[PDB]
Design a protein around this ligand. Sequence first.
Ligand SMILES: Nc1ncnc2c1ncn2[C@@H]1O[C@H](COP(=O)(O)OP(=O)(O)O)[C@@H](O)[C@H]1O
Lengths: 349, 16, 65, 64, 203
Amino acid sequence: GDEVGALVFDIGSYTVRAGYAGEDCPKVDFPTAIGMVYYIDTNALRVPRENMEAISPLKNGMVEDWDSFQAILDHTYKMHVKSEASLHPVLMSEAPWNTRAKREKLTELMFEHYNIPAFFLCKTAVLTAFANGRSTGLILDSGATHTTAIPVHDGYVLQQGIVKSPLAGDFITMQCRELFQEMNIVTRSWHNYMCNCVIQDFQASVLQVSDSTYDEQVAAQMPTYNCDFGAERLKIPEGLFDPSNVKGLSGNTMLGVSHVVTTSVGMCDIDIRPGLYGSVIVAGGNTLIQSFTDRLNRELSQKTPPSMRLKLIANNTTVERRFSSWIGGSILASLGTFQQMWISKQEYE
Amino acid sequence: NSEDAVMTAVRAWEFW
Amino acid sequence: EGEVTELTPCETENPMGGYGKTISHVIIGLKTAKGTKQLKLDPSIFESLQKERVEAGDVIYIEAN
Amino acid sequence: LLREAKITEELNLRSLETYEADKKKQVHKKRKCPGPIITYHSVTVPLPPARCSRTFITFSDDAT
Amino acid sequence: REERGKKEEQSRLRRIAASTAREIECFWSNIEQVVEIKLRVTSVKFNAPSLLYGALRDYQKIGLDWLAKLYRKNLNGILADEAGLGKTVQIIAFFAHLACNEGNWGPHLVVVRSCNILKWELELKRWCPGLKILSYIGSHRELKAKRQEWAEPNSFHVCITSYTQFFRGLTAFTRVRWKCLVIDEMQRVKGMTERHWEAVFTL
Ligand SMILES: Nc1ncnc2c1ncn2[C@@H]1O[C@H](COP(=O)(O)OP(=O)(O)O)[C@@H](O)[C@H]1O
């Protein structure tokens, strides 16, 4: 139970999490989108300065603009961490499947510019599994840029059974747009960013998932101007699980959350599928939708082989599910293996 | 039942 | 007896348990004046091999039973 | 509904009151292990029924 | 040699990841164990056995049958049987049948002596477990926290109260409606000069 004071970072697509190890809640949380003319903070989101382009370091779940990554890391170490970045280990949280070149570039940039004495990174599925308190399981993450069913066995991502669907930040940023326009309505990038923000607010406010196939529903009102929305709010979320249910705006084929889970479990080797089915874990931001886990559970039960247990984690009530990765990373640097299994300062040199 | 699968895997390893 | 050429063919962990690293057999390359003959002895003897200074290039006196 | 709710609630209460494990102690023993533990393991395997003995030696880390 | 080296590198990475996973899982298990240790320490006879896990005896079932007339005919009588026959089990079976037959649960009350509170809730959890029961301790502070989920919600269908606690909170129990008011060992309720009579009358 030794603690050295490591700063665990997690570069998310919607909000970056950071804070000292040994905490049960991310102390740092703010939008990750960088506004370059070069301001990265909630202030940047608020300040209406000269023409600004809204972009993010992550693209399809992979860091593309290293300049923005360096900028956000420096801004964090300067204002949020309020401590010099030369006497504190770092536990980076990469993507579900990171590449050799990306990890090499990250390690090189770190050890060169920041001179971190100890830098280590691990998968996100394993971190979430550790946060939930289980080694074997099936992580069902739905982030702002991708949703993936990552089967983990003994805290290691089974790269052979990974899957992915187009469910990303484009979930309702443009569907809810037309849904609202049905009744009625600094650069273009900033306008799109503000539109996405207000659409996410509308989502967290009224968007709800049904328990079964789409059906009539009473209307609900909410400000933005005020309007009363009928069952329209219950239509778009249907596309997350069943493609046949959404027949008009879901193309010809689509791997829903349930179908994604089934495919991920089927692609895995024998002797481990029972453990995966028994312990199913959900993650991401889209899981916060109302009645999401309920529909997921009551639907996966139908698409479940006989005598196969299905016991998920009932943590959706708490908002910390989205930060499960950060919780796992923080609790990771409080063990004895932190000194045994770790990358020191003279391993790469 | 688990022990049955375990011994079957052991027999498969022996044949290998 | 004969000049030893120790080598342990890596084998999958105990199939009855989990995974990892185990050794199911230990091959010793006893080389005699007439020729060479590798013996796939029991792995439990590995302790005896490490006990004495049994390095590649020396003569060892093995016992059947 | 509320019926199954109360059923599960009192079942949990009964489990708690009756809990008034060896596997946990074995896991603790494992914790205390420095880590480079070599395990001598031999089990009976088939070729009473005809069978034979097989020996296995598991090495924790590559150092050993 | 090349392919075996590649496979061995992959297996070594797998094993390092598995060791880290085992370590973190063991630490989480220790934390959970510590948390759990800190937290824990002309007589129709047709009865339904649904939710009756505790086995009942023949005479117990017969007694249950004889007393079915009370609830069905809206009658009340005294149950004076020699100790050792388990009247608590009979009342538990009655509460279970009230739900097995009709869909009405309602909020119930059971008056038990101070030295018999734990015994009664233990028996309830043992015989016919499925139920919602609450205890009454700490009349000053603890009860105040428990009385914050009774008005609007039906957090519990049965309550195990004590005699001495009623007289200090009559203004609270008389507000909520109740269906069954069980009182055991009426020997303490045989003196008219006591104030318990008028206190329990207005229920
Ligand atoms: N690349 C990613 N991988 C995993 N999770 C992500 C990723 N990007 C964003 N997330 C999480 O998903 C959430 C998406 O936000 P959103 O679902 O719109 O909020 P809400 O639905 O609660 O209104 C973000 O809060 C973010 O933390």
